[PDB]
Design a protein around this ligand. Structure first.
Ligand code: ADP
Lengths: 41, 66
């Protein structure tokens, strides 16, 4: 078709946030449950 | 010991330690090699308390200092 373009695109900022954010709940995943292991900081 | 704990019966004789000065197995209770129970009882219960808190370590995040 031929209608509204969205010249703008910081679409990427969202996926970027999600990925740079999901990487957090990653380091954690390992410590869930009676088989979860502790972290040493 | 592996044997002694076979009727542990005959004349059970653990307390058999090492006599490194000579290089042979002797009865340490006789020989005079005594150590308080309270030591090897805490020396053990303790050393594991460490090993475990470390056995659980799977990721070591080291923050940058100042
Ligand atoms: N006996 C068990 N068998 C299977 N799951 C269990 C058992 N006991 C507790 N869990 C699970 O351990 C999960 C995660 O606990 P934990 O790692 O301590 O994180 P949190 O408790 O903070 O969610 C709990 O959501 C629970 O479902």
């Amino acid at each position: 078709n031929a209608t509204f373009k969205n010249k703008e695109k910081p679409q990427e900022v969202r996926k970027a946030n999600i990925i740079a954010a999901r990487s957090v709940a990653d380091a954690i995943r390992t410590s869930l449950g009676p088989k979860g292991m502790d972290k040493m900081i | 010991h592996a044997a002694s704990q076979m009727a542990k019966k005959r004349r059970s004789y653990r307390n058999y330690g090492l006599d490194l000065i000579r290089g042979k197995i002797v009865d340490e209770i006789h020989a005079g090699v005594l150590e308080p129970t309270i030591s090897k009882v805490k020396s053990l219960k303790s050393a594991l308390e460490a090993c475990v808190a470390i056995l659980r370590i799977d990721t070591m995040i080291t923050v940058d200092p100042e």
